[PDB]
Design a protein around this nucleic acid. Structure first.
Lengths: 118, 154
RNA sequence: AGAAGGGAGCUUGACUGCGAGACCUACAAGUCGAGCAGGGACGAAAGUCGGGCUUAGUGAUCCGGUGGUUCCGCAUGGAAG
RNA sequence: GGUAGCGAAAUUCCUUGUCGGGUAAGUUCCGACCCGCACGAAAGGCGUAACGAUUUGGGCACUGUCUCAACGAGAGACUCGGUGAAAUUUUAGUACCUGUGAAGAUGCAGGUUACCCGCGACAGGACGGAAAGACCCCAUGGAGCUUUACUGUAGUUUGAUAUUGAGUGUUUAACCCUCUAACCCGCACCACUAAUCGUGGUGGGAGACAGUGUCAGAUGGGCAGUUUGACUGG
RNA sequence: AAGCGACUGUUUAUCAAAAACACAGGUCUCUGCAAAAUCGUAAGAUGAAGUAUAGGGGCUGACGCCUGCCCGGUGCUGGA
RNA sequence: CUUCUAGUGAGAAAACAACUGCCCGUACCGUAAACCGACACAGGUAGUCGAGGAGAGUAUCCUAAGGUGAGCGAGCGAACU
RNA sequence: GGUGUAGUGGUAGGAGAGCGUUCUAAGGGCGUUGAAGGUCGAUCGUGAGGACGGCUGGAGCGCUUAGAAGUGAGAAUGCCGGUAUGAGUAGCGAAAGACAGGUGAGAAUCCUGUCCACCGUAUGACUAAGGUUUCCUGGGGAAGGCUCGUCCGCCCAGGGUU
RNA sequence: AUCCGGGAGUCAGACUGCGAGUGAUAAGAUCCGUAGUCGAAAGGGAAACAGCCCAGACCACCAGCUAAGGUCCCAAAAUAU
RNA sequence: GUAGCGGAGAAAUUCCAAACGAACUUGGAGAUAGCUGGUUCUCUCCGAAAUAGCUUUAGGGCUAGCCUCGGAAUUGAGAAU
RNA sequence: UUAAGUGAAUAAGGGCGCACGGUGGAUGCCUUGGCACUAGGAGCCGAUGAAGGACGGGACUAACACCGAUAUGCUUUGGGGAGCUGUAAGUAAGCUAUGAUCCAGAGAUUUCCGAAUGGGGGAACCCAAUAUCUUUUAUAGGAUAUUACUUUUCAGUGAAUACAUAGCUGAUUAGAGGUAGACGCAGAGAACUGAAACAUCUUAGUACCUGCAGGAAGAGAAAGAAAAUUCGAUUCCCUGAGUAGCGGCGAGCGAAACGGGAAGAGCCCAAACCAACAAGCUUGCUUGUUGGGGUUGUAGGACUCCGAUAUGGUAGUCUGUUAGUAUAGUUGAAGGAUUUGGAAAAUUCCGCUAAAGAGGGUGAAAGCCCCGUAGACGAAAUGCUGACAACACCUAGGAGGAUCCUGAGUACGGCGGAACACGAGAAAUUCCGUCGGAAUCCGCGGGGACCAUCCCGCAAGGCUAAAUACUCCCUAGUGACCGAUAGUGAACCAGUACCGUGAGGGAAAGGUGAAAAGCACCCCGGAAGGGGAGUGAAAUAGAUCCUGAAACCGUGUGCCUACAACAAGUCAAAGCUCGUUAAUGAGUGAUGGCGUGCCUUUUGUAGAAUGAACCGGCGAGUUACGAUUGCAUGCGAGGUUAAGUCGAAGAGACGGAGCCGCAGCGAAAGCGAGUCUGAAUAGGGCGAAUGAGUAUGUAGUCGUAGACCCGAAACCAUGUGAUCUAC
């Protein structure tokens, strides 16, 4: 009882080629080229889910430094001041305030300045 | 490889030609070559020990009885082999499924009448197998044939 | 150096059957051994003695030779083996 | 225990030996010398006219061989119309320097330089293409060759015995002989018969020898099958 | 002018034409004819329709002058 | 082919006339585009004939009888081969 | 079922549990009111993988449970087929032609003429091998002819060797 | 951990502390002993870097704290005392 | 005319149908290769070695050591202080 | 207006997404041909001219099928009943109800080559001799028979050499060659390989070559197997058993008899003796020819004595009588309407049939439409197999023990080789070569060297069915076998085209539609090709014709792109363009961070180490038989059958030979819950002390087999080459 290899390989290969839409040239049209490229993209995406969380933290931190130097402080002294006062705002909300509500950011910077005035 | 009508000569040389070393026009990887490990003529049959044969026969008829799926009848007699009268008999006992008809002996008019009905199988009482009883929904056995089966299964 | 070194007397234990338990070790081999039985040497005894202060001096199996034997022996008694 | 003859040689390591010649200048050449690593008399020694698409050194003549290049003719190349391949090829949006790294990077780090697309030319790189290194070692790989490597063998030879018979003598059984009927004849004549084959027949020669069978001892790279270890700064 | 080979000839079809091979001449040795030698299991053949001034085998290689010493070893021949 | 006999062995010499005489090949290429070279391929292929001037000549140059213009072209007039 | 605590990089390799292909049996189904196959979609599951919808297509095919296997492909300087790159690139195989006029859908290349040029111990004439119809006449232009072609040793029809 | 049984793979290692031989107390050399990493290990630091320093990735987050190493600009954090 | 365990050689390992230290074709034959290349779906748990001994042995193998799966067993036999 | 600043848009060409085409032939579905078997037949043809070929025969005839100058066919006996002159269209001529065509049995004709056979030869050609007959006035020309070689029988002639034997002529008798790439019995007879090298040994008396066969062959009727109490010719299967043995005792080779079965069957000569004839006429009875007798071990026969002169069988014939059987055929039940379609067998209603619901066809899927099927019937002729008849053959008891017979250069022995599972071994038994060489029933052979005793047989002569092996071929079927790169090399005009001097090597290539209805007519164009119009359910089904994937080549467009160093992506993200299986939507994307392919082999790779141009198809741990372990089921101190017989190629019962387990120890004699060593009751080794097995299924590993696939250089054995080159 013989088993022809009819329509299984074409389905698997067309599933692979559909993931390669938008690539350059023979990297979206030939199966071997696309196979290798798709493997590399899997590697890159796993790597970059972890690197994302670092990039936004550096972005927030630099915006907060910029805002605080306008209120007579630097980033490190203002973070210490907020900790000595028991304030628990993220660096995300801090930067969001720094860009949207400058008066709220100044209220907070004054609390920090009074905390480390002791 | 060795049964395909083909070649014993080395097709090209072993080196120089910028090629791949090949040994015959009839190798498994050549188009038109011989098959590696195919089907061969084989047997497929074996035997189970004698007590479990007998245990399976008893068990399958006893299952038929434990659900009121065996139907006993005094006799099945016919002066001519007529299919129509057999179908009337079959409805006389309200039988509407696949049925094994177990007959006795040279009851040849009955077996002729019961052939050809597409729900009906006919077997004599010295020739019942395990596969005949499991496939049918009921058994229609005559009184004579029932004692004859009890005589051989003992 | 309570000799394992060196002299004198008598002797053949440079014994037979063994062996609880250890050591070494992939295997095959290698090493030590109290004690029991038979029959002894030396010594008045207690005792010590299964070669030499200790550790090198050796070579599986197959095949062949010599001696022993209360074993087998192709119908039986022998023989060949 | 190397004679005549020859000798830094188609042979001489040291060595470009030393001396004379030829050049302005000569490790090659020619003449000689003898200290011949390692000439030498038929695997011939030393001469030698004629001859050589042989090997070597020097002269005259002639010249684009060269100083040192220039011009000209034709064919390809270049542009247009017709026709129309190939080796190669992981995908390519395919710069340079100093470093790094399987220790010599277009592609990695830091810099420096650079608008997009082609045509005619040159060969520095792509450890460029073509050929699963011919060099070296391994496979308890092969194959051809050698022999005083092992084990065999064709061929040649020597004895016993069968074919295989008969008589005399000489000695301690063996031996020398003589015979004629076997066996042999690539001798002559005759018939089958058109015949240098063959078979028969008669002479002649030779003879229990030879040839042939079985067994035995020698010899046998003529020919055959194989073996010829490992460790190791390759 | 010098080396090699006397000479005409032959050779690695397709990287070597030569100082290599051959050669006329020299010498040693085998062979009395059904010769020795070679093809073949044998029959049959070449040698040769020849017969030692002939036929086979080894070395040297026109021609000129010449070709020393050794028979212990190994082959070959003869011996008893 | 020509003689000489041996030889089964009527009587054939030579005039005219008129009659008889079987089988196979026969085209075309053949110093080539038709054969051998995978090709409409700068190679190879036995024999006979093979003219004039000047010349020893079948050498050499130009020609007679005969054959042919060769199966990619038109321009330009660089490097380099 | 809840809740706690602990664990969960991996080559050679051992152990477990599954996905998909073809065929057999039994059962329950679908199909010209359109099966398999093909193509597209922004859909589902922890993975192999599973659906549903459009277009194409024209006659067969799923699902459940068990069985049996020529049962899964990216690589062997693998084998067969089809198609690219190099690229409109190398080459187009020794040599003298020019013009007028014909034919024709169409002419450097076929026909006819005129002048020019080449071989001439051959590139002339005859023949033995070898080939085997290539020979003659009338038509043709899809392929062969290294371009072209109205032409041909090519193609079609008839005929020729005494 | 030990005992019985089914199935294996491995028998070319490399560098870095430390302590020895060969070497010239040379080698990214060679040969042993002892610990780690690599082999079979991603992530941060060391410009780039198998083997050094920190640390062992089941998965999701645009939340937080630290390690080695750092805070003038490239480039996150002190032009700190 | 001479044919492969062979022929022929004015001798070069030279020729025997473009290949000769032993032609070509078919068969034994799927010769042998301790060597080189390749060996096709998924997820979960665990997870080595590059050493010792012996080897016509040194890039091969065998036994032990080191991994994995199933069972048995008294324990308090394992480890770290 | 002047200065300073910021600055879009515009594409020669390219990228991404999407839409439509072209090329190409994957995928699906399908079969016209294959593969493995079962049951039955048949198992040879040929000098009375084979197997295989060449050349011919048609109204037109290149090819294939058929046939042979009587050529696409002739006669005859049966069947069948309307069309027919093959493929094969196309046309032209015809034939048939006075029976064509077609089908089965028996006949007739049958060129040329070939064993080839009158002589020759480069197969299908050439050349004769002798008789009879023909054309011609005649020669030349045409036809028919006969003519090889050997053997084996008989005449004539015949001689070196007289008698006659070689020889020669004539008549008679048989052979000769091919194959079925199979099966059997003989002769001669390798190598690679395994032994981790290699010589004995293995591969293996295998492959190849040569002879002889037959439908089967071979063996076959005890000089046998054994061991008390025996049995009776041969062959084949199960088991004994991987045992007893053999072996550089290495790799490895490896029995037999007993026990259970299939099938069964026995016969004929030589010799003694007795007659008829011929020669030696010893006129002794020595040589012989025909006929009779006689066939064995419990010894049998001859011979003498009497009985009987009947009765049991055959493996025999091209002799009769029927019975069947193979080769053609006959007959054979039962349905209409409705819906959707081009067309129903599908759907819905309402019926019928079955000793027939196996299968194939029909415009889609049919018990009831067609061919069939279950059942019933049939043969002029020829061939097979039974039965019963004839005819042919063969077959008798009892007693005696005076004498005669019972297979000779044989059995056997020495030497050398081989065959037996048995390699010279302590080597019985059976063969071959060589030499030596018995006895005669008061005898001769065997029981594994050899002897004695006992037991079983009677060599040196011949034949014989069945039970077992194989399939070129014909009939009827079957398959958890293939489905066009598969299955035969070959589904198609294949051993073909093509390649080679030759032996030899050797392919590619299936599919319109239900039906050709295969596109009349018009238009552009030399044509090819195309556009309308028509056929058709559909032409984007139009002959390169089902479906129509990818590489690769184009055309159109939404978004991006000419200051930029890019393993080509990934994460972050403005602008533009859309709007989906509706949800934290889709395409493109300036600009910013990060980032050295895949595979193999390695201590270690981006590697300047290795492989791949790309796309598609194909392409690698399987099976048989054994051994072991785990899981599972049935029985349990027990478990289980093998070959074989009946049965549907099956299930589904018989069959207890045999195998494992239930007891061990020892080299063995032997003893036994114990035994061996030992003087030992000592000690120690191995065992017992409740301590579970066996059959089958399934999976993991191993052995023998090519054993996961591909790959050498080589070795051996038949054959084909001097059309090139050497002499």
């Amino acid at each position: 009882a013989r088993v022809k290899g009819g329509t299984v390989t074409r389905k698997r290969r067309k599933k692979v080629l559909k993931l390669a839409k938008g690539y350059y040239g023979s990297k979206h049209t030939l199966f071997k080229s696309a196979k290798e490229q798709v493997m590399n993209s899997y590697y890159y995406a796993f790597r970059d889910r972890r690197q994302k969380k670092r990039d936004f933290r550096k972005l927030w931190i630099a915006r907060i430094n910029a805002a605080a130097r306008m209120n007579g402080l630097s980033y490190s002294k203002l973070m210490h001041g907020l900790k000595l006062a028991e304030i628990d705002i993220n660096r995300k909300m801090l930067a969001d305030l720094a860009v949207n509500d400058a008066a709220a950011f100044t209220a907070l910077a004054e609390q920090a300045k009074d905390a480390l005035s002791k | 490889r060795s049964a395909v009508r083909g070649g014993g000569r080395k097709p090209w040389r072993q080196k120089g030609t910028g090629r791949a070393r090949q040994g015959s026009i009839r190798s498994p990887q050549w188009r038109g070559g011989g098959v590696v490990f195919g089907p061969t003529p084989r047997s497929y049959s074996y035997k189970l020990p004698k007590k479990v044969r007998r245990l399976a026969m008893k068990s399958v008829l006893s299952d038929k009885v434990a659900e009121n799926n065996l139907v006993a009848v005094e006799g099945l007699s016919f002066d001519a082999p007529k299919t129509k009268e057999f179908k009337q008999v079959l409805a006389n006992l309200s039988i509407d499924t696949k049925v094994l008809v177990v007959l006795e002996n040279g009851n040849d008019f009955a077996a002729l009448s019961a052939r050809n009905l597409p729900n009906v199988s006919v077997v004599t009482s010295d020739n019942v197998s395990v596969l005949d009883v499991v496939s049918a929904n009921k058994v229609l056995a005559t009184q004579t044939a029932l004692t004859q089966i009890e005589e051989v299964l003992a």
